[PDB]
Paper text:
While this crucial step in protein maturation is executed by two types of methionine aminopeptidases in eukaryotes (MAP1 and MAP2), additional roles in disease and translational regulation have drawn more attention to MAP2. While MAP1 and MAP2 share the common pita-bread fold, the latter is additionally characterized by the presence of several insertions and a charged N-terminal extension, which consists of segmented regions of alternating poly-acidic and poly-basic stretches. However, the major determinant for binding to the tunnel exit is the MAP2-specific insert domain of ~60 residues, which is locked in between uL23, the universal binding site for nascent chain associated factors, eL19, and 28S rRNA helices H53 and H59 (also termed ES24L). Taken together, our data show that it is the insert domain that specifically directs MAP2 to the site of action on the 80S ribosome, either the PTE or the A-site.
In order to build CtMAP2 into the cryo-EM density, the crystal structure of CtMAP2(∆N2-73) was solved at 1.3 Å resolution. In combination, these tools allowed for a detailed structural analysis of MAP2 bound to the ribosome.
Residue numbers in the entry: 74 to 444
The structure:
């Protein structure tokens, strides 16, 4: 009767005609916070933020519908460019914002670049223009998609593979992410969550080419809280046990992500850079390159503090910007985020959800029937 298309092009509001988007997985807080579910005070407080919640849920439903398409489309033989462009075009169509006029991408659309990270690369790879890389049968790809509505950013990610030998690695990381999500809640201490994530993940091992490898958490990667128009707040959620005693609090939003690896369990920056973000705390700089000054205005007027990638500049007709972009990075105005890799020959996997720590309940807003 009324369904999404292939690829997704139907405005999400057409599929939810009352303008209300579905809640994600709602979980009661445990023990001394269980009173929150039925507390009239906390229910009224939660209801004050109905528009915030509904925007978050719109972004999460777009995320689900686009990743459903991706899960059916992405296979060996597809190019990274066509996958990324397919995801991006679907997100923008569903939210109704082409993101070409100044300010339009800041209303709704991509929350950050599409991560398409293969094998020993765990994160922060996105093809730049002219990229010709095609997925192979023995690849393990992490697809990290961000959707925002009015600056409410849903960050959720999953891994795909086509050779069954990798399945235990994917299962390990999915299980570890789900254990971290289960531990999350008001007053939970992030370093203790990390220990639970680690215990679950390290209970897995995977045989690759005749040798058995323990699955190791990537110890220098972590989840984080999410702020308006800003993917990273000040709080971290480690994926190993640490003595970070920071607590989750009412009103927080967290990206609970875990990464597992058959290699060292540690990543370094390596490879072509595609991902960038304007720092809200950028210092004052006497910019002399005309092209750094013009590029900064393009960035502020189109992306604000949302992360962007090179192709997001290319599609705005920017052609001579790499000098200026590197200058804004060197001057501390824009941060760069190079691809992150474990050792050559290793395989890494990622699963991630966004959770809302509401006054009443925990909402795993990006949960779907897929993961
Ligand atoms: Mn992510
Ligand atoms: Mn994240």
């Amino acid at each position: 009767p009324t369904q999404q298309s292939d690829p997704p092009r139907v405005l999400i509001s057409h599929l939810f005609p009352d303008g209300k988007y579905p809640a994600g997985e709602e979980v009661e807080y445990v023990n001394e916070n269980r009173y929150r579910t039925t507390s009239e005070e906390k229910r009224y407080l939660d209801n004050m933020q109905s528009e915030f919640l509904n925007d978050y849920r719109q972004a999460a439903e777009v995320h689900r519908q686009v990743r459903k398409w991706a899960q059916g489309f992405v296979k060996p033989g597809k190019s990274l460019i066509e996958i990324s462009e397919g995801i991006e075009d679907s997100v923008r169509a569903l939210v109704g914002h082409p993101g070409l006029e100044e300010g339009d991408a800041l209303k709704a659309g991509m929350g950050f670049p599409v991560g398409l990270s293969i094998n020993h690369c765990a994160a922060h790879y996105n093809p730049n223009s002219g990229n010709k890389i095609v997925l192979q049968q023995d690849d393990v790809i992490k697809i990290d998609i961000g959707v925002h509505v009015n600056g409410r950013i849903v960050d959720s990610a999953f891994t795909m593979a086509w050779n069954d030998q990798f399945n235990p690695l994917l299962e390990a990381v999915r299980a570890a992410t789900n254990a971290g999500i289960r531990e999350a809640g008001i007053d939970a201490r992030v370093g203790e969550i990390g220990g639970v994530i680690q215990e679950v993940m390290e209970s897995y091992e995977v045989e690759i080419n005749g040798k058995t490898y323990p699955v190791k958490p990537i110890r220098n990667l972590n989840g984080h809280n999410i702020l308006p128009y800003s993917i990273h707040g000040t709080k971290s959620v480690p994926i190993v046990k640490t003595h970070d005693q920071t607590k989750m609090e009412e009103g927080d939003v967290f990206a609970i992500e875990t990464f597992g690896s058959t290699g060292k369990g540690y990543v370094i920056e390596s490879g072509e850079v595609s991902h960038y973000a304007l720092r809200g705390d950028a210092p004052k700089v006497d910019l002399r390159l005309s092209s750094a000054k013009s590029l900064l205005n393009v960035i502020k007027r189109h992306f604000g503090t949302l992360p962007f990638c090179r192709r997001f500049l290319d599609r705005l007709g920017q052609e001579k910007y790499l000098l200026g972009l590197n200058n804004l990075v060197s001057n501390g105005i824009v941060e760069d985020y190079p691809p992150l890799v474990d050792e050559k020959g290793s395989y890494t996997a990622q699963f991630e959800h966004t959770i809302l720590i509401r006054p009443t309940v925990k909402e795993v807003i990006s949960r779907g029937d897929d993961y």
